């Protein structure tokens, strides 16, 4: 109701921005992109002959699907949500079906590659700047969005002046959503998170470059802020500049908890 779509039509659904808290205009100090970009020589391995793929002529719901087997099993139910018994603490690598597979584009193992389905909103929070919340009920296990931005080396990330939007992919590579990013750059840290990041492979299987997919870790109410646990590789550094405002009774990074 301040901006009708911060994604400028690049996502399956519009992502509006509103501010009912202070006077800050909807953010524009970044470039919205819906897929990861490169700014240097990366040479992602896109060799189609390198892709592990399945020979299924059904909808890939069977345990014989190789792509499922690479994932230990396919973790998506008939509605494309993670199984309840999915390891939310230590997620497996997910290998979705791809362009080398025999199956059709509508098979059951292509959730993340199909993009955003739920209604989300960029909004102004009370104490953590901008954040992202749901405009609908979101059952546990639902794909939300991908952490998208600028692919950079470990070495490059570590000389980045702004280290508020760096996501480590595993000697490793990093997604910096500071200058280039999607709606996920706006998701805040919660010590009692309702979404989890998962490493996924789709159109390539270059293990240096998993793509980061957020799934709901429990049922989410309309209007609830989305957030994940950023982890200690973030807060070890960042807590010396600011403290956690998630307000949870289990908060691990508050001004208080650090003092206690």
């Amino acid at each position: 109701i301040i901006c009708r779509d911060v994604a400028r039509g690049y996502e399956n659904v519009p992502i509006p921005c509103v501010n009912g808290v202070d006077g800050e205009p909807c953010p524009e100090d970044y470039k919205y992109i819906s897929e990861n970009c490169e700014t240097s020589t990366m040479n992602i391995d896109r060799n189609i002959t390198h892709l592990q793929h399945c020979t299924c002529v059904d909808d890939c719901s069977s345990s014989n699907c190789l792509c499922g087997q690479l994932s230990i099993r396919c973790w998506y139910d008939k509605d494309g949500r993670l199984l309840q018994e999915f390891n939310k603490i230590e997620p497996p690598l997910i290998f979705e079906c791809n362009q080398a597979c025999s199956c059709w584009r509508n098979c059951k193992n292509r959730v993340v590659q199909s993009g955003i389905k739920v209604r989300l909103q960029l909004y102004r929070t009370a104490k953590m700047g901008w954040g992202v919340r749901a405009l609908q009920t979101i059952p546990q296990g639902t794909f939300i969005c991908e952490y998208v931005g600028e692919l950079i080396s470990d070495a490059e990330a570590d000389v980045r002046e702004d280290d508020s939007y760096l996501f480590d992919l595993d000697e490793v590579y990093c997604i910096d959503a500071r200058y280039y990013g999607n709606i996920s750059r706006f998701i805040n840290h919660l010590c009692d998170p309702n979404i989890i990041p998962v490493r996924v492979f789709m159109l390539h299987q270059d293990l240096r470059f998993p793509r980061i997919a957020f799934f709901s870790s429990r049922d989410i109410r309309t209007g609830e802020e989305l957030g994940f646990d950023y982890g200690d590789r973030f807060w070890d550094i960042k807590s010396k500049y600011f403290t956690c405002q998630c307000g949870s009774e289990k908060c691990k990074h508050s001004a208080e908890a650090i003092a206690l």
């Binding site: 996501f167 950023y230 550094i237």
Partner: peptide, 9 residues
């Protein structure tokens, strides 16, 4: 230990 903050899975 790195010089910059990194979110992680």
């Amino acid at each position: 230990t790195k010089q910059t903050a990194r979110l992680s899975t």
